[PDB]
Amino acid sequence: SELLVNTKSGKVMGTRVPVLSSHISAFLGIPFAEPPVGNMRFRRPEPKKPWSGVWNASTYPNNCQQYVDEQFPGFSGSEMWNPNREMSEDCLYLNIWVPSPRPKSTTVMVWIYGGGFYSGSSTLDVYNGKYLAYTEEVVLVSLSYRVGAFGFLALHGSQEAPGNVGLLDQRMALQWVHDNIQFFGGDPKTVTIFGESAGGASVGMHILSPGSRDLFRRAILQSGSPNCPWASVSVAEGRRRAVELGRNLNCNLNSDEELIHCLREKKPQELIDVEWNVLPFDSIFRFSFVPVIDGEFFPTSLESMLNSGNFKKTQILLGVNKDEGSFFLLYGAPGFSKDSESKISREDFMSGVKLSVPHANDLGLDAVTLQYTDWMDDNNGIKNRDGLDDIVGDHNVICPLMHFVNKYTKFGNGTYLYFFNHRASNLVWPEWMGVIHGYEIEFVFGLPLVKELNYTAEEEALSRRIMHYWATFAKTGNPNEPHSQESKWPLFTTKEQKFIDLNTEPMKVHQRLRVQMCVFWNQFLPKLLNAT
Numbered sequence: 001s002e003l004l005v006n007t008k009s010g011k012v013m014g015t016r017v018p019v020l021s022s023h024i025s026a027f028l029g030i031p032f033a034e035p036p037v038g039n040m041r042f043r044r045p046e047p048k049k050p051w052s053g054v055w056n057a058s059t060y061p062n063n064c065q066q067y068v069d070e071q072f073p074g075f076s077g078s079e080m081w082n083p084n085r086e087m088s089e090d091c092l093y094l095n096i097w098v099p100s101p102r103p104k105s106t107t108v109m110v111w112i113y114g115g116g117f118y119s120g121s122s123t124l125d126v127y128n129g130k131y132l133a134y135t136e137e138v139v140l141v142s143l144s145y146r147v148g149a150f151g152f153l154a155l156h157g158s159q160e161a162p163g164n165v166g167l168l169d170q171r172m173a174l175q176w177v178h179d180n181i182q183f184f185g186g187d188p189k190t191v192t193i194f195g196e197s198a199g200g201a202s203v204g205m206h207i208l209s210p211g212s213r214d215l216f217r218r219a220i221l222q223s224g225s226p227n228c229p230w231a232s233v234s235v236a237e238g239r240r241r242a243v244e245l246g247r248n249l250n251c252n253l254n255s256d257e258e259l260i261h262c263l264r265e266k267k268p269q270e271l272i273d274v275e276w277n278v279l280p281f282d283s284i285f286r287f288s289f290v291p292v293i294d295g296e297f298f299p300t301s302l303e304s305m306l307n308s309g310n311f312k313k314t315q316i317l318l319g320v321n322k323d324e325g326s327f328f329l330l331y332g333a334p335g336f337s338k339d340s341e342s343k344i345s346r347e348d349f350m351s352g353v354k355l356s357v358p359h360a361n362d363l364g365l366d367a368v369t370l371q372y373t374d375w376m377d378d379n380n381g382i383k384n385r386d387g388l389d390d391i392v393g394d395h396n397v398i399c400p401l402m403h404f405v406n407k408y409t410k411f412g413n414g415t416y417l418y419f420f421n422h423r424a425s426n427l428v429w430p431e432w433m434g435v436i437h438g439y440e441i442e443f444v445f446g447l448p449l450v451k452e453l454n455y456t457a458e459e460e461a462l463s464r465r466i467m468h469y470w471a472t473f474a475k476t477g478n479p480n481e482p483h484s485q486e487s488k489w490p491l492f493t494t495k496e497q498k499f500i501d502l503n504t505e506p507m508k509v510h511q512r513l514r515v516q517m518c519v520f521w522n523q524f525l526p527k528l529l530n531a532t
């Protein structure tokens with residue numbers, strides 16, 4: 001039976017799923033770890049004890065306990081990211097889409113969802129691996145991991161809540177793929193891990209972490225870097241927030257044992273309710289529980305690891321979307337609202353700058369403002385709005401990614417950089433938000449091929465082109481077809497620093513993606529703040 005697969009953990013029974021006039025197998029909800037419930041909350045993941053009998057892998061699993069966005073009730077643009085299954089601490093499962101007939105040893109792609117490490121689901125409609133698995137003949141896997149305090153509460157030194165447990169969930173899922181994907185026709189020697197936002201950061205973190213390197217072949221990072229300012233915290237900061245969380249829940253704060261015991265007795269929603277109260281600054285684009293630089297998962301500082309070449313050397317394909325800041329400005333900056341063009345005043349511009357660079361002194365704030373202000377037309381509401389979008393995006397995603405790409409490329413075996421600047425025609429979010437972060441995913445997952453989704457013919461073509469770029473790269477370490485008549489996506493080199501735009505227009509190659517702004521963020525500003 002094509003829908004029955006025997007693994008080292010037990011037999012699983014998938015389901016025949018229809019996809020673009022055909023069908024494929026889908027093994028949904030396969031457990032890869034023991035439910036992190038009870039005294040297991042905050043602890044490292046334990047492997048899923050093998051089971052007797054057949055595991056029903058015909059339906060999606062529960063989503064992990066997480067903060068749910070309710071800013072725009074009923075709005076698809078926001079709810080399309082919210083959990084679409086019952087939330088549960090028992091959420092460490094993975095889904096696999098297998099081509100029919102079951103392949104023998106084909107390329108495997110493992111998707112790691114984003115969501116600032118505080119949210120995310122593998123079951124979202126935009127993450128349906130159906131189209132990519134079918135169109136590209138790949139075994140597509142989507143894993144899950146604990147988010148929020150559940151996956152990142154860090155009381156370093158403690159065995160009960162060491163921190164980084166959400167990253168270990170990812171690793172365990174990767175371990176399970178390593179050990180069993182062969183039974184689904186996947187080639188364990190050719191596994192490409194790919195993710196967006198916190199998932200992209202995660203991908204880079206697995207490239208860095210010694211304990212994860214051997215579990216995959218290549219990597220794809222979309223709008224995420226392990227070095228993003230919001231993707232990790234020091235062990236001191238993690239401990240600080242863990243205690244403050246306990247303080248929010250009236251916990252005995254005399255010992256880690258009592259803090260952790262208290263936190264474990266709290267219902268999931270209780271931790272989620274006060275989750276955001278632990279942030280150190282009035283800021284945007286900062287999340288409470290994220291990976292901690294523990295000296296275990298990450299041997300030393302990300303920067304030193306990057307400098308020394310202390311990371312997995314392989315091929316990587318990565319990039320960003322044009323407007324990486326609009327989302328967090330809409331949700332937290334004064335003057336922005338979903339239903340207006342959000343033209344920003346000078347007053348709100350400076351308030352935004354302050355929210356964007358949390359612990360920057362006045363001089364730092366001045367450096368940012370001068371850098372992003374057109375003094376010939378400083379009251380231009382559209383320029384002030386777009387200027388803020390750039391500040392938030394550059395600082396939080398684009399420039400950190402550029403720093404990582406340049407550091408990596410020095411030791412890597414091939415880099416491919418893209419700049420996705422096509423706004424989906426059916427995008428429900430306002431126009432001012434632009435090519436919003438996360439809206440390239442639908443193209444990566446081939447949603448534009450489904451006519452009912454209302455995409456243009458051009459968008460379907462772009463989707464197919466992106467999917468083939470992703471799959472060909474995952475399969476060969478090069479997004480380009482060996483000897484083809486199509487425009488060639490050049491390799492990013494330390495010298496040339498080439499990249500391509502990803503849109504419905506004919507491929508165009510550029511160099512030094514936002515160098516001007518990134519020299520400011522990566523070189524100048526850090527030096528300024530260090531001195532002051």
Ligand SMILES: *[C@@H]1O[C@H](CO)[C@@H](O)[C@H](O)[C@H]1NC(C)=O
Nearest residue numbers: 013015054055056057058059
């Ligand atoms: C779960 O597995 C059983 C195996 O007998 C199957 O009959 C059932 O239909 C599956 N659940 C769903 C919702 O299909």
Ligand SMILES: *[C@@H]1O[C@H](CO)[C@@H](O)[C@H](O)[C@H]1NC(C)=O
Nearest residue numbers: 314315411412413414415491
């Ligand atoms: C990648 O590695 C192979 C073998 O070590 C080498 O021949 C090739 O030149 C490398 N490519 C890049 C872009 O570094």
Ligand SMILES: C[C@@H](c1cccc(O)c1)N(C)C
Nearest residue numbers: 081114115116196197437438
């Ligand atoms: C999916 C994506 C997202 C995109 C836009 C808005 C959200 O609230 C979440 N994650 C990765 C950060």
